[PDB]
Amino acid sequence: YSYTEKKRIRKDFGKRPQVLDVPYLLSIQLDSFQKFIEQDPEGQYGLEAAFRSVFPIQSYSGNSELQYVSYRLGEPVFDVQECQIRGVTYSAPLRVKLRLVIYEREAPEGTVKDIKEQEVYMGEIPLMTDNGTFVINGTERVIVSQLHRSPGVFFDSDKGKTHSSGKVLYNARIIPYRGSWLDFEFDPKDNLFVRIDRRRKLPATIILRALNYTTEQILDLFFEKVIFEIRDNKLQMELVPERLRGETASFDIEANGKVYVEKGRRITARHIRQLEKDDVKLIEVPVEYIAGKVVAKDYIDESTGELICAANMELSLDLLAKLSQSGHKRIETLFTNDLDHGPYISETLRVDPTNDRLSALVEIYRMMRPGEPPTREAAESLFENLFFSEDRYDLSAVGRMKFNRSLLREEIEGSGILSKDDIIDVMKKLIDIRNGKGEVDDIDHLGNRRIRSVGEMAENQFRVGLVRVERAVKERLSLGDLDTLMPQDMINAKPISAAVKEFFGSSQLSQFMDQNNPLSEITHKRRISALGPGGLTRERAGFEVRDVHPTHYGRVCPIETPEGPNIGLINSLSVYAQTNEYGFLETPYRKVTDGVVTDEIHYLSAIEEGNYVIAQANSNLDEEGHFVEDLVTCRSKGESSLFSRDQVDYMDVSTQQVVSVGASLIPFLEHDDANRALMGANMQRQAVPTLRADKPLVGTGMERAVAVDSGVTAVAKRGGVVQYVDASRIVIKVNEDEMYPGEAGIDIYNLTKYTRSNQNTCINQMPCVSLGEPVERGDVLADGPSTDLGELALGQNMRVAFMPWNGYNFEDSILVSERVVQEDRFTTIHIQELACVSRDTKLGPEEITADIPNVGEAALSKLDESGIVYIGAEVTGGDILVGKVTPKGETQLTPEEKLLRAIFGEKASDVKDSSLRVPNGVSGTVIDVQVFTRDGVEKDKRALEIEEMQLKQAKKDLSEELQILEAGLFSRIRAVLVAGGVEAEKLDKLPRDRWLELGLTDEEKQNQLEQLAEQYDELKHEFEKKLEAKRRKITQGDDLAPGVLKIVKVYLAVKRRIQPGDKMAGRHGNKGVISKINPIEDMPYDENGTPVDIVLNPLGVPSRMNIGQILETHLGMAAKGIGDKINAMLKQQQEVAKLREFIQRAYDLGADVRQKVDLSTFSDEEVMRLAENLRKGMPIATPVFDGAKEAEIKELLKLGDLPTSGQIRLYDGRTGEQFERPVTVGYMYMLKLNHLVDDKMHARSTGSYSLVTQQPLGGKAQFGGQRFGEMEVWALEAYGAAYTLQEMLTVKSDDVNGRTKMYKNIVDGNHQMEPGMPESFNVLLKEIRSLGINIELED
Amino acid sequence: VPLDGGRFATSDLNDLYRRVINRNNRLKRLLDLAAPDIIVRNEKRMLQEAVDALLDNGRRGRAITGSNKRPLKSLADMIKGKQGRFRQNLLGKRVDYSGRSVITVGPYLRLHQCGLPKKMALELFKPFIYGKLELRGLATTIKAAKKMVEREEAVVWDILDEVIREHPVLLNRAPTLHRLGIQAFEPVLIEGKAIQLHPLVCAAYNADFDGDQMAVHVPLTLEAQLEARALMMSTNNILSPANGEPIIVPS
Amino acid sequence: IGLMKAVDKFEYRRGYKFSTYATWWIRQAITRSIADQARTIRIPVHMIETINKLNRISRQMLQEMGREPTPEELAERMLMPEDKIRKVLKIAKEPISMETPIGDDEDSHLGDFIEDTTLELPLDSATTESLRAATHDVLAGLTAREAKVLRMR
Amino acid sequence: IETPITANFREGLNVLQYFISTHGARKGLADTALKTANSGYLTRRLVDVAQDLVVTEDDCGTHEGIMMTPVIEGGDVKEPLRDRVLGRVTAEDVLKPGTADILVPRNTLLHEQWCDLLEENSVDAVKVRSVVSCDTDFGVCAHCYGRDLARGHIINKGEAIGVIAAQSIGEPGTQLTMSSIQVKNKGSIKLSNVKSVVNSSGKLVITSRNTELKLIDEFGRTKESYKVPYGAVLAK
Ligand code: 118
Ligand SMILES: [Mg+2]
Ligand SMILES: [Mg+2]
Ligand SMILES: [Zn+2]
C-alpha cells in the first residue's frame, strides 16, 4: 500500500475485478489547446494550418508577394498569480517571420530582383494554465465544448404529414462548414426540385444544364435503354426476362417454344423463369404496344435534314411510320418499370422553361438576385462562385469523409469543393430512396453529431482575423513604390488581437468558473453544450433532441442535467468516454476470443458498435474468461436480448462506465428513483466547505481521484524526505536516484492561505506530512478546501432518527440539536472585497484623506494617518474603511437656513464626504489591504509600507538556497587543498571565508583553488540577476484606466453559524430547511443516555422511492459501531496483538470480495497509527452497481454487538416516557448548501427610482422593490379589494406627488391618500403622439 | 446619461433621429444646386427609408443595425409586446413597502397569525415609528428619530410592538394561480430571519418547506386595512370558490 | 456633390484628363462628411487630426517595441506636453446603447439599472417643512415691526 | 419494450434496467416544463375575454332556463342530479311525479334541504336558471347566477364573476394529461324516437336510425341509456 494510503485504509465491498484504470479526468481540455499552439510540420492543426491557408498574399496586379516562413511564441511578462493580483490577462506574444519578394513582368518572371526578410509581431495569445482554465482580466474562466451537427449530406423525409393524402415526401441536404446550402426535394406530383439557401424553388434539371449537359446525356446517366428493330416492318425487341417483372400482358408473347402468357394472365416468377431457362431472344410484338413510350435519342431525316422525333418525345404509330418511311432500322426507348423505375427525371424535364446553358444560368441569376437583367459574364461568374471556388466554399476535412461514406465510395480524403459527380450521386441516391432502396437517417444518432473544443473554436477565429488582415495587405502591394518598403510597414495587428480577445472574453461558451468545490470545477470543465454560435436556440428546440437515445450508452450520462427550460440541452461526459480524431465520441470494450474474454481494449464509435454483439458487465466468469452460463444478456442493433455464449464479440470494462463523475459518488444508486438521483447529483455541487473537514463513513471508492485530479492539493513531484514543514510552506529534500546531476535538489511548495474564490468562499491549504518522514512521487502533501488526507469531503456525518416530532419536521423540515451548533460543525468562512476609486473631476481631483469634515473623532480612531483602516480591525455596518473627500460646487441656501447660519454663525466648507463604508448587516474582520497608484502620482505612507515589507520578505525567500550551493562548495574545497596531509581540526578553528589562503598544495590544486573562486563568483553572477528582477517587478507602476488616480481594496472575513432558514441536503435527493434549534435535553435519547443529533420525517421516503437513504443509515451505524470497539481498546490500554486480531477480523468480512489486506506485514507503529486513525469509525466503499448486500450489512452489525434489525428503543426527553415502537437510528452524511438565509432576506421602505418611468428599481443589490405582477392584480380584483389596488398602483409605485405626500401624512399620524395619474401613462401618451396619432383625454 | 467612469449611455431613438435630420438637410442642399434628377430621386428614396425605420424598423425591408450588429429599437417596439409599455409598466409595477424571505413552519400558531422577523418589520414600518417616536416626545425632530432607530435603542423595540398591534400584513407566493394566493395575517414578532407560516394554509398556497420563498406587503391607509381585515383574512377563506368544498383539510 | 464641383472647375486646355482633376474633389467631399457626421458627440476637425496622428504613432511604436507604449513614450516622440496627451486619450469613446444585454438572458438590459439622481428624499422634505414651521414660531416672539425687518432682510 | 423490469427498489436494478428506466423519467420531466406555458397562455386568454362581466342587477324577470338531468352515459351514473342543482334557482314550478306537487314560489335557492326533499321523492329533471339566458344587458342578475360558492348564500350585487370563472377554469390545467347490449339490473325497458315492424322469425325490428333505449327503475328514474344501430333486430 502507498505511503499516504497506508494511513487510513477504506474497506472494499466490491466484487468485480478492475481491468482498466480511470483516465486523467481533464484530458479533454488539455489535449485540445496543445494542438492549437504546437509546431506541426504537416499542417492541418492550429496556427500552422492557419498561416498556410492565407499566405502567400500576391499583388493585385501580379507584381510582388509576401511569404510566410515560420512562427514562434514568446515568454509571458507576468506569471499566473501576478496576473490575478494585478488584474490583467495571462498571455504570450506571437512573432511571425515573413519575406517580401518584388518581381517584374518586363522580364518573363524574374523574381531575384530583391528579397527583404523581417520578423513582425502579430498579437497576444491567452495561455491555458495547468488545470484547464484561462485567467482573463484577473478572473478564471472555462471554455465549454459544443455538440453540433456534422457537415455532409443528410437524407430525410416528412412522414405523411405535409400533404392531405398522407404521402411521405423525401428531401436531401448538403451542409458545408462554410459556404451556401443546397437541397433537393420531392413534391406531390413526383417532380424533383432544387433550392439554394432556402430560397424560391426551381426544377432540378436546371442545375444539370448549367453543368453543360444536354437532354441526351441527361437521359443517358439516369435511365436504361431497350432497342426496337424494324426488320420486316415487324417490331422486334431484344429482351432479358427480369425486366418484365410485375406486369400484365396486353398481347401474346410467342417464342421458339411455349406460348407463355396471354390475355388476362399476369406474369408470375415461373413465367420469366421459362423465358430465362430457354434464353428467349428477340420477340415480335404488336405495333400498338410501343405506341406511348418515350424515345431516347434525337432522330433526323438524312435527306431533308428535318427532324422526325426529338429526345424525350412520346411515340405514336404515326411517327413510327414516319420514321420507318425514312430508313431508320433501330429505335432506343427508356426502360420504365412503374414500381421501381418510375419516370421521375424524365417527367421533370418537361416542366422546365430552359433549353440550354445560357437560359439556365440566366434563370439561376434571376433567382439569386432579382431586379436586374444579367449579362453573359455576370451569370457565369455568380454560378462559378457558389460551390466551385475554394475561397467561398469549404467542406471540412470531416465533411468530405462523411460525404464519401454516405455514398458508399471508397476514398476518405478529397477536396473541399463540390464536383459534378457529387451532385449527380446525390440525385441518384435520393431517387433510389424514392424507389424503396435504402432508408432515411436520423439526426439524433451520435454518429451524426460531433464535439468541437477550445483549440478548434480558437483557430476558426484566428483565421477570420488573418483574412481581415490579408484584405488590406493586398492594397498596399498595389498602390505605391515597393523599393523602400519593409514588411513591418504593411501588417496592422489590431484586427487579429480584437478577433481573439472578443472570443475569449465575450463569447457565450466562455464562462465564469464555478468554484464552490473541487467537484464543482471538475464538473464545469467536462460539460457539453448544444447552445452557442452554430447551435440550437432554447425556444426553438423540440422534444426529440432533449430525450435519451440508445447511443448515449457509455458516451453521455443519462442522469445529470438541469431542470428548468435547459433540461435536455446541457449534458455531462461519462467516466471513460473519449473523443475521435474527427470529434466523435467513443467507448472502451474488451474483446471476446473463442468464448474467452481477453484483456485487450478497443475504443468504438456509435456507428461501429451496432454491428457487434456486446455482453454486459454483470456477467460471471469461469476463472479463465469463460462465461459461467449459456444464455447471456447482450445488446445488438439498438436492442437487448438473450444470446448464446458463442455469438458474443465484446464486453464492457466496468459497471460504472455509464454514469458521469458526479453520479458515481452516490452510494446505493441502484436503489434510487431516477428523478431523485438527478436532484442528488445536482445538489452535490453546491456544498460549502466547513471549518474542519470530515471524510464520509460510507463512500463509493471514487473520492481519491476527484480530489487529486482537481489540482486543489499539493502533490509531490519527486520522492524524498520532508526537510521542513510550516503552516505556510513545505521543503522536500530529493532522493539520489531522482536527483538531477546539475542542481541542488530541493523542492519548495508554497501554500495558499485564506484566499477568496469566485463565490466568496475561502480557499486555504494546510499540511498533512510531519517533519522527517519519507515521501514518494505522487503523494499528497497538503489538503485543499473540502479534502481530508487526500479524499473529497463535502460534509459531516450526523446521527439521525426517523420519526415525527410535534410537527417540527412537517413538510421536509429538519430539527437540529444545540450540540450541533455549539461544536461548530457547519460553520463556514466567507471573504468579501470592497473598493474605493479616486478620480478626476471638472473641479479638480478627489483625495483620499483622514481629515473628513463633520464626523466625530471617535469614528476616526480605526484609521491610520494615511486615511485607511488598520489590519486586524473589527468593523460593523456603517463604519468608515477609507476616507475620501470631493471638491464641491457652491450651493444655494434657503432663506430659513440662511437665517439659521446668521444666528448660530456656522459656515460650511468646500469639500464633500464620499468615503467607503461597511454595508449594513455585515460585520467582519479586515484581513488585507491593497493600493494601486498611477505612474506620476505621489506614493503614500501606507503604499510605501506595503512596498517595504513585501520587498523585505521578498528578499528573504531567496537567500535560503545559496547556502545549499555556497557552503557545501566550501566543503568541496576543504578536501582538495588538504590533499597531501590532514589539517582538519587546525582548519576548523579559523573563519571559513579565509579558506582560500591556507597551506597551498601543488599547482594542480592551486589552479583549481582559483577555479573555486571562479565558481564562488558564479554564485553572485546568478543571484543579483534574480533579486533585481524581482525588486523591479515589485516597485513598478501600473496601467489604471484614463481618469483614475488610485484605487484601494479591502478584504473582510465573516463567520456564519447555522440557524433556522438554512438549507440542508443529502446525497439522495432529500432536501429541506432547518426549522428549530432545540435544547440538548429535549431530544430523544436511547437507554444509555446518548441523545440524537437530527430528526427526520419518515413520511418522505415511501412516495419518493429513494430507498438508498435507509440502507446508508443502516450501514453507517455498522461502521461507527466498529470504531467504538477500537476506541475502547485504546482507552483500556490493550496490547498490540488484540488490536491486530480485531482489525484483521474486520477487514476479512464478507463474500468473495476482491480486496485483500494482510496486517501480518505491518510494523507495530504502523498498526498503532492505523488504529488511531480508525478510532472514530471504519470507512466503507460501495461502488454504484456493485455494492454491498443486506446479508453483509447484518453480518457487520453483528460484529459490533448491535441490533440486526437496525432499530432501537428511544425515550422522550421532555417527559421521560418510552415511544411505543422501535425507531431507525443511524449515521447519515449531510451537506450545507450555499443558499444561506442571510443572503435572501430583504426589505425596503423607500429608496431610489428609475430614470424614464420613475418606478422603484429592482433587486437586492439595488435596494429595490418587489414586482406586483400581472396575475396578482387578478387575485386582488377577484377579492373586490379596490382601495388596496388603487394604492398599489398610484402612491406606492409611480405617482410622484402622492408618494411624497403620503410619507408626510404617515409621519403626522393620518392614514389617508390623495391619488393622481401615474407617470407611465403620460409616457405612453407621448410615445403614441410621436407616431403621428392624436390621442387625448376628453372631459 | 453619464456613467461612473466618464462613459456615456444613450437611447436608440437618437441614432434614428440623426439619420432623418441629416438626410433631410442634404436634400435641401441638392434642391439648391439644381442637380440632375437621377440624384434627387436617390435622395428621396433614402429619406423615405429613414423615416420608415424610425417608425417601424423591420417592416419594409432589412432592419437597420447598430455598431454592435443588433437591430435598433423603434417607436413601435416600445409599445407592443411582452416587454412594451402596456404589459411591463401599466398592468404590473414595482412597489414600495415590501420585502421577501424564506419560509419555515411554526406549529404553535393560530389560524390568523404569522411570524415576522424583527429586522424586516423595523425596515418596513419606518415612517410609522418616526411619527410615534416624536409624538411621545422621545425625540425632538425627525432627524434625531432617524439616529435613534439606526442605533437600535431599547425604546425602539417597545414602539415597534405597539405599532404592529392590529396591523395586518399581506403574504403572497408566486405563481398566483387563484385568489387564495394572497392572504392577510396578523404578525407576531420573532427573532431569526425566516418567516413562519401556519401548517394549515400550505395547501391553498401550494407551498412547502424545501426552500420556497414568500413576499410581504404592507397596507397603508384605513380603507386598505378594513379590506384586509374583512375580505382577505385567512379565517374567511375556508371554502373553495371553484367548488364549494373546504380547503383547510389536514394533510 | 464633389463631382458636381469638379465638373464646374474643369479646364480642358491644360491637357490633363478629367479623372486626374476630379478625384481630388470627390475625396475631399467624402472626407469632410465623415468628420462632420458619424459621431453622436461631434469632435472638431483639428482634434480629429490629432487623434489620427496619435493612432499612427502608437501603431508603429507597438510594432517596434512589441508592447503598447505608455503616454510618456508617446509624449517623448510626439513632442507635446504629457498633460495634453492625457487629455486627448479621453475624447475618443462612443456612447453605449441602453439596450445592451447584460446577463445570461436577453430580457435584462443596461438601461434597467440606471437611477434618477435629481430627486429629493422625503426625509429632507419633512425636515424643510418642520424647519419652516419652527422659524415661523420663533419669529413671533419679538416685535412685529422688528420682525418685518428680518423678513425683508 | 418486450422484457419487463422484474426487480424492485428493495433489491436493486441492473445497469440495463436502470438505463431503460431513465427514458420515461426524462420524458415526464420535459413534458411538465413545456406544458406550463400552454396552461398560462390559455389562462391569460380566458381572463381577457371574461374580465368585464359583473353582477349588475337583482332580478331580470325571465322565465327561460335550461333543463338539468343527471349524466348516465358511459356506464353508471357519473354525476347525480343533486350535484348539478345545488345552489341554482328554479325556472318554473316543478312538481313531484304526481300532479301539482308544488315546492316553490318558483324562485327558490335550492339549498340542501330542498335537495333532500327532491331525493326522498324521485324526480330526475328540473328547469333552472342560467347566465346564457339572462335578459340583463351589460351584466348578469343575482338570480340567474345563484349561490356564491365560497360564502354559501346568494351572490352579492357588484361581484367580479368573470375573473373568478377564468381563474377557476385555468388553475387545474397543469394536471391535465395533454357487439351486443347487456343489462345489469332489473327494470322496465323504454324506447324513444322509434318506428317499428314485426319480423319473420318472431322478433322486433325498427326502421329508426336515432332511437334510444332506456332502463326504468322501481320508481321510474332512468338508470341506463343506450342507442341501437340502424337496421338491428331487437331481440325483445
Ligand atoms: C489621388 C491620390 C491620393 C489622394 Sb490624398 C486626399 C485628397 C483629398 C482628400 C483627402 C485625401 C493626399 C494626401 C496628402 C498629400 C497629397 C495627397 C490620400 C491620403 C491618404 C490615403 C489615400 C489618399 C488624392 C488623389
Ligand atoms: Mg437559469
Ligand atoms: Mg417548495
Ligand atoms: Zn337574469
Short mmCIF file of N, CA and C in Angstrom, two decimals, chain A residues 31 186 201 212 291 319 405 424 452 486 521 564 596 602 647 770 789 973 1022 1118 1157 1191 1259 1267 1283 1304 1310:
data_model
loop_
_atom_site.label_atom_id
_atom_site.label_comp_id
_atom_site.label_asym_id
_atom_site.label_seq_id
_atom_site.Cartn_x
_atom_site.Cartn_y
_atom_site.Cartn_z
N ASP A 31 -5.75 18.31 -24.02
CA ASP A 31 -5.29 17.79 -25.30
C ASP A 31 -5.74 18.63 -26.48
N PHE A 186 -38.70 16.36 -53.19
CA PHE A 186 -39.84 15.87 -53.96
C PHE A 186 -41.08 16.69 -53.65
N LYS A 201 -38.13 28.09 -55.19
CA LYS A 201 -37.91 26.75 -55.69
C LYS A 201 -37.85 26.71 -57.21
N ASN A 212 -23.31 22.05 -68.29
CA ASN A 212 -23.06 21.69 -69.69
C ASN A 212 -23.48 20.25 -70.00
N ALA A 291 -46.67 2.13 -78.84
CA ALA A 291 -47.25 3.46 -79.01
C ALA A 291 -47.55 4.06 -77.64
N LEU A 319 -45.79 8.57 -85.93
CA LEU A 319 -44.38 8.93 -86.02
C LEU A 319 -43.49 7.71 -86.22
N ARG A 405 -18.51 8.59 -47.23
CA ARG A 405 -19.03 7.40 -46.59
C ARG A 405 -20.54 7.28 -46.71
N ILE A 424 -24.49 14.59 -59.00
CA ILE A 424 -25.17 13.50 -59.70
C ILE A 424 -25.42 12.33 -58.75
N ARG A 452 -16.81 19.97 -30.83
CA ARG A 452 -15.68 20.86 -31.02
C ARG A 452 -15.34 21.59 -29.72
N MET A 486 9.40 47.74 -46.05
CA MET A 486 9.66 46.58 -45.22
C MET A 486 8.35 45.96 -44.76
N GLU A 521 -15.70 22.36 -9.95
CA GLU A 521 -14.81 22.69 -11.06
C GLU A 521 -14.62 21.51 -12.00
N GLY A 564 -34.71 23.27 -15.47
CA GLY A 564 -35.52 24.34 -15.97
C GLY A 564 -35.78 24.16 -17.45
N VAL A 596 -13.66 -16.67 -24.62
CA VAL A 596 -12.69 -16.32 -23.60
C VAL A 596 -12.51 -14.81 -23.63
N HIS A 602 -10.49 -2.00 -26.88
CA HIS A 602 -10.77 -1.36 -28.16
C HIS A 602 -11.77 -0.25 -27.94
N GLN A 647 -21.97 -16.24 -29.68
CA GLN A 647 -22.33 -15.12 -30.54
C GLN A 647 -21.86 -13.78 -29.98
N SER A 770 4.39 15.30 8.49
CA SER A 770 5.14 15.79 9.63
C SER A 770 6.63 15.74 9.34
N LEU A 789 -7.04 14.14 4.15
CA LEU A 789 -5.96 13.19 3.87
C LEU A 789 -5.92 12.73 2.41
N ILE A 973 36.06 22.31 -1.38
CA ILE A 973 37.43 22.79 -1.49
C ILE A 973 38.23 22.51 -0.23
N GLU A 1022 24.77 34.63 -10.59
CA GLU A 1022 23.39 34.19 -10.74
C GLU A 1022 22.43 34.84 -9.74
N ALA A 1118 -23.16 0.47 11.32
CA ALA A 1118 -22.24 -0.66 11.45
C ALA A 1118 -20.79 -0.21 11.42
N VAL A 1157 -6.33 -7.51 2.56
CA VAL A 1157 -5.47 -6.76 3.47
C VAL A 1157 -4.90 -7.73 4.49
N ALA A 1191 -27.20 -9.08 3.61
CA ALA A 1191 -26.54 -10.11 4.40
C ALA A 1191 -25.23 -9.59 4.98
N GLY A 1259 -34.17 44.49 -7.38
CA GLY A 1259 -33.05 43.69 -6.95
C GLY A 1259 -32.62 44.03 -5.53
N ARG A 1267 -41.93 43.11 -7.47
CA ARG A 1267 -42.85 43.24 -8.58
C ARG A 1267 -44.23 42.73 -8.19
N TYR A 1283 -59.53 49.48 -2.92
CA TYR A 1283 -58.65 50.51 -2.36
C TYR A 1283 -57.22 50.01 -2.21
N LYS A 1304 -45.48 62.23 4.47
CA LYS A 1304 -45.74 63.26 5.45
C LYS A 1304 -47.11 63.14 6.09
N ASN A 1310 -51.80 60.38 10.11
CA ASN A 1310 -53.02 60.50 9.33
C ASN A 1310 -52.94 59.52 8.17
#
